[PDB]
Design a protein around this ligand. Structure first.
Ligand SMILES: CN(C)c1ccc(C(=O)NCCCCCCC(=O)NO)cc1
Ligand SMILES: [K+]
Ligand SMILES: [K+]
Ligand SMILES: [Zn+2]
Length: 361
């Protein structure tokens, strides 16, 4: 039907308080509203996740400590400290984002929509009892566990710059959820996991697909790799629902300065997934050039709505942040692509061999 847009003014205000991305949620929604895209979507207010719902993946012990420090020596033991500081109210922030993704997943299984959007979600590094990489709660896993009540095989596609290790670890032992992550992979780069030989464990073996990619990849080659993998994944795995993480830290201009992507390339990967006509949960999380992240997700929202957007950024609250040209398009950086053609073919062929075992159920 009409895409569902998870939004409430209190929810965006909560997401703006994250120290790593101040006011990014307001910038994203303000630009989407500036293009009047919210009038073409069904606005759904997100609920706050309960302790029972967060406990479907996270352990009690980790959730108790998170709730205590939210209002300590054992904080480092649960991954709280450096990348994830235990600030006041951090448990309610986690429950808010986790509940937003659960809400979007609930809309999918109720037949209310075929696409549900929660751009502020997709924190894919958190483990069942350990925070990691700015992630205290793994709302992506919680969203998958909610769709799992109705859909038998769920495909998780992680297009963030970083490896989605938390989601992959959560389902590394099952064949009922397949994780596919395209990410920068280089010794020293966070989180350091997700080589192409990472395929899963036990009965989940060959149901974890990882595409290690080097710096400087652009739209054309990226869609070549993504369409090649998604085509083989769709025919070998035959999914019934898709969870799509679209972190914008791959876009040119991001301080990560690794990939050299534009939203047009990500949108072509998104169009290929929407053509499957499946229930699709859209997440974001990643993105540290605030204006470029709003640019990307606004463009991707238009791709979902099938609309073509005006190049000029309309005047709004955060208009001054869209220099230097104040247009929606993003120009790739003039730096080399470090992806050798023979290395990419070697990675794709290795994945093709792994997926042949999936065609032998
Ligand atoms: C300049 N400065 C203080 C820092 C710069 C980079 C990092 C970092 O990458 N840390 C490793 C954790 C990265 C997790 C990124 C989360 C993400 O986007 N996942 O997709 C840390 C501090
Ligand atoms: K990824
Ligand atoms: K798996
Ligand atoms: Zn990232």
């Amino acid at each position: 039907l009409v895409p569902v847009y998870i939004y409430s003014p209190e929810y965006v205000s909560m997401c703006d308080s994250l120290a790593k991305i101040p006011k990014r949620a307001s910038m994203v929604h303000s630009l989407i509203e500036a293009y009047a895209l919210h009038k073409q979507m069904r606005i759904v207010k997100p609920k706050v996740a309960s302790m029972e719902e967060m406990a479907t993946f996270h352990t009690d012990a980790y959730l108790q400590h998170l709730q205590k420090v939210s209002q300590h020596p054992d904080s480092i033991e649960y991954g709280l400290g450096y990348d994830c500081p235990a600030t006041e109210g951090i448990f309610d922030y986690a429950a808010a984002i986790g509940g937003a993704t659960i809400t979007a997943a609930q809309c999918l299984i109720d037949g209310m929509c075929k696409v549900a959007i929660n751009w502020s979600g997709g924190w894919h590094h958190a483990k069942k009892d350990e925070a990691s990489g700015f992630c205290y709660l793994n709302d992506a896993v919680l969203g998958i566990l909610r769709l799992r009540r109705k859909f038998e095989r769920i495909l998780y596609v992680d297009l963030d710059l970083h490896h989605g290790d938390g989601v992959e670890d959560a389902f590394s032992f099952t064949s009922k959820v397949m994780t596919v992550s395209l990410h920068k992979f280089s010794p020293g780069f966070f989180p350091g996991t997700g080589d192409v030989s990472d395929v899963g464990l036990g009965k989940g073996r060959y149901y974890s697909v990882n595409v290690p990619i080097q710096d400087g990849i652009q739209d054309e080659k990226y869609y070549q790799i993504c369409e090649s993998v998604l085509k083989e994944v769709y025919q070998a795995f035959n999914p019934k629902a898709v969870v799509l993480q679209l972190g914008a830290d791959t876009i040119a201009g991001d301080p990560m300065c690794s990939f050299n992507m534009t939203p047009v390339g990500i949108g072509k990967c998104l169009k290929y997934i929407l053509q499957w006509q499946l229930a699709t949960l859209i997440l974001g999380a990643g993105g540290y050039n605030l204006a470029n992240t709003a640019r990307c997700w606004t463009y991707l929202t238009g791709v979902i709505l099938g609309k073509t957007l005006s190049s000029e950024i309309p005047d709004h609250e955060f208009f001054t942040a869209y220099g230097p040209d104040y247009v929606l398009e993003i120009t790739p950086s003039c730096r080399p692509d470090r992806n050798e053609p023979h290395r990419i073919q070697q990675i794709l062929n290795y994945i093709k061999g792994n997926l042949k075992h999936v065609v032998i159920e």
